[PDB]
Amino acid sequence: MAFAQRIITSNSAGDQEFTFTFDYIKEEHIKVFVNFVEKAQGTGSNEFQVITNTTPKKISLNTGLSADNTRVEIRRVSSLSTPLVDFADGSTLTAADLDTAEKQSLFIDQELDDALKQGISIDTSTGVPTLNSQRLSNVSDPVNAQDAVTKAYLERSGSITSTQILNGTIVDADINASAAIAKSKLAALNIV
Amino acid sequence: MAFAQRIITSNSAGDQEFTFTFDYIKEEHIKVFVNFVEKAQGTGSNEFQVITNTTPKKISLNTGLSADNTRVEIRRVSSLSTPLVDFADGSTLTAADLDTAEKQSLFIDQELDDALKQGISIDTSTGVPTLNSQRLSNVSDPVNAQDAVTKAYLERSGSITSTQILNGTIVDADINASAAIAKSKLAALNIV
Amino acid sequence: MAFAQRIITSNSAGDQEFTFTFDYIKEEHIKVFVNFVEKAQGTGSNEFQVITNTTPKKISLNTGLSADNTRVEIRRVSSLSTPLVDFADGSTLTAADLDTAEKQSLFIDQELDDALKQGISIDTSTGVPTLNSQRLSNVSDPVNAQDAVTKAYLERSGSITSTQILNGTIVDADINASAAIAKSKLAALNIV
Amino acid sequence: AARTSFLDAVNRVLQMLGEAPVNSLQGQFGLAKQAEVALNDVSRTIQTEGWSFNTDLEKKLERNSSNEIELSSNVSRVVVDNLEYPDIDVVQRGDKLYDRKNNRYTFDEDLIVDMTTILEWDLLPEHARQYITIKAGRQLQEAIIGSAELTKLNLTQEVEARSAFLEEETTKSEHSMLRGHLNRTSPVNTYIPSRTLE
Amino acid sequence: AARTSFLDAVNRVLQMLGEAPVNSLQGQFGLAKQAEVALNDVSRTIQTEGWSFNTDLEKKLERNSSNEIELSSNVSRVVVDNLEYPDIDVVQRGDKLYDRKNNRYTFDEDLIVDMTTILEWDLLPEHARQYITIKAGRQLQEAIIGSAELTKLNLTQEVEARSAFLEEETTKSEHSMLRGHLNRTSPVNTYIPSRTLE
């Protein structure tokens, strides 16, 4: 399963609290997203706070949900910019510092694995990549002979060419009645 | 090169010995997959065994393959959920523990990097991570406009609409001769 | 901003200086790429050196570029195949070694995250994977059309299926003037 | 405060033996191998008896191309109900079932059995972990040192641990006499003569 | 964690004796061979009694040309049904049967007997493996060193192991008193007096 994240599709407007199960080192390592908007941490004016007293722990929002079916994501990120423990000479080493370093490293690796799996992984069914029923988006207009095709590039005016046509399926149902077709470009039925 | 994963297509049925070159920590950290089937470690009815008395070290199945060209994969995955060291107070700190912790961290990072490379990897000359001669699949039928097309969608009944056709190619090469084409739905003609 | 990479499109030909901001441990960990061609580090027969005397640090080449708008890439990479610091028994512990080990681990994690981001990300506007408007190539032909359609397969003569063309837009734009359309393929209009 | 880990169990076993705690398990330069083998052996000995947390009900078994049933590597015991199969008597032998009555290694149809598996350390519950740790420490000390006072203290601790583990198991899995054989789907209400008289 | 193997059993016996573990079993240079011999001897001693997993019922025996019954090298005991054969009773002697009533070594037709076989270490089930291991360890320790308190401790462990083994056997085989001698096919439903009263 996902190691340090949980994605919830809300079910009722006005709710405030959502539960989460994974572990963490410091409270400021928890991030909350509301409808693709990152949510700041704090209290009062800040919109959410963490309740670490009840099992399982849950996060409480200071303002109720405006509309139901609004996605809320709880994901843990450790400090990727600075080490959590600094060693200085003359200090008596204790197991707490070493354990903190080990937990930081392991949690960072777990989160990286989670992100890699959540992205485009490899479908083990045939050993091929999969999107897991997603939509590929923001792909530039193909140029090279081996790119993928886009709906925009396929549907832009004049996209289909003469070589892009194979005969046999000029359906009469979709043939326009009001179309103006010159007789020179037309065929000649052989009426016996 | 592939740091900690070797995938081999079995040449002939009945073969049982395969070789590997990556380093490891424990004999239980090596996993073998055979076309999605998972094989348990051990000896006896256990369907694969490890051999270390010969360089390079090699694994051995306990039953020959039924058919040739069956994919066999050897991958090393160190512990991801449980640390290999947990410092306890009152012990005698030795360099072996620190070296083992360093090795575990390095091996985890190597395995994650190799998994990312095994996935879709950046196409340097272009920029999008190329599938590298693989059939991306397991994408559901299109739901929105920009969603890509699948086989069961592009070959599905009812996909014929009134937009994408063009002119300049349609000939007798594929039009059914025995088909009764409506004269009125067909085009015009002047017989001079 | 990527932690440990920077891509520069040369403003003009003949320049030899390029700046960078990220920190590092050893200068041997700095790789310089130009036009997807790797250049060695050193002096004389080499192509580039590293100047750390000023701030911010910059790298200098031994020869100017041939043409303007040339791709120049500078990215850090730490030692993956060997731990930077090994612990020996029978000596005095120093905080410098522990700090160096922590720095190496953090830098490797940063670099891996940067690689994943420069590869495949998830857009924070819709939550679907995005490519940041790049170009995809080296994709094998879709044996099943579950795969994204390759434009070579689209534009290949006769590769278009009869259902790929959707009748309804018949005009005189693309019928060739001298196209000898098979006469027995269209009827006549009901001329009164 | 998470559950007990393998390293904590090894440290506890060493401490009960009377030595200094060890830092880790990997590449150790001490008694880690002895502690590990003791813990594994005691875990296997406890598991091979069959409890409520390592038993599957009405599991289907499938034969191979030669009408032969092959068990997995970690299957400890296999039970077949007598009443459902009045003509077939099976007993486990190595890793294959044996048709005792007909003196054959072959069968005519698939079976519905209930088997007991041996679980890894990570998947055990807390009370099982505690009992396993204490028993392993007692056995290791008794086999290695052989003193008197340490043996007495370990005996007392082991007795207390066994009492606690058995009590936890029974209150968790609510064994009953009225229900009879558990393979029957519960028809019992267990109505309470202690409540409804007012 | 698979079932106990030969190398693990040998290491366990050596550890119970109190001597360092061995690396392998082939081409070793220690007491591992003596431990193997003790294991084999205790295995034979236990198996020669006749339990649920090593007894074949209704088995048919075939004679050779000289009208004699020959037994394999690993056959421990045979029993014939007195009711089924009134005028002939047999007792095992070496590898041949003796018709002690008629004082002849020759029979007239084939027999339908119950046979008990001594099995190799591979085919033995888990509880039998554990009991064999503990018993062999105790016997070898007594033979090598010769203490008394160590014998007391090993006797305690052996008693516990025997209790566990017997409980496992009686839970597996499901013996009964109503059914009588098992050579008759089960007509008993063992209908439960407890539950079906509501």
Numbering used by the authors:
A (entry chain O), B (entry chain M), C (entry chain N): 1 to 192
D (entry chain v), E (entry chain u): 2 to 199
What do the study authors state?
The portal-tail complex of P-SCSP1u consists of dodecameric portal protein (gp16), dodecameric adaptor protein (gp22), hexametric nozzle protein (gp23), and hexametric trimer of fiber proteins (gp28), in a similar organization to those of T729,32 and the MPP-B cyanophage P-SSP723. By using the symmetry-mismatch reconstruction method, the asymmetrical portal-tail complex of P-SCSP1u was reconstructed to 3.8 Å resolution, enabling us to study the detailed assembly between each subunit. The cylinder-shaped P-SCSP1u portal, 170 Å in height with the largest external diameter of 160 Å, is formed by 12 copies of gp16 that are arranged around an axial central channel. Similar to the portal protein of T7 (gp8), the portal protein of P-SCSP1u is composed mainly of α-helices and can be divided into five domains: C-terminal helical barrel, crown, wing, stem, and clip. The clip regions of the portal provide a basis for connecting 12 copies of the adaptor protein gp22, which bridge all other components in the portal-tail complex. Each of the six fiber trimers of P-SCSP1u (gp28) is fitted between the nozzle fiber dock and the adaptor fiber dock. The platform region of N1 tightly interacts with the helix bundle regions of A2 and A3 by two pairs of hydrogen bonds (R766-E20 and D737-N24) and one pair of salt bridges (R766-E19). Collectively, the dodecameric portal, dodecameric adaptor, and the hexametric nozzle in the portal-tail complex are intimately connected with each other, with a total of 60 hydrogen bonds and 18 salt bridges, providing a stable platform for DNA ejection. The succeeding loop of the dodecameric portal protein constitutes one of the narrowest sections of the channel, which was previously identified as a “valve” and suggested to function as clamps to retain packaged DNA in the phage T732. According to the radii of the channels, an additional narrow “valve”, which we named valve S, is identified in the P-SCSP1u capsid. Intriguingly, an additional gate, which we named gate 1S, is identified in the middle of the nozzle located between gates 1 and 2.
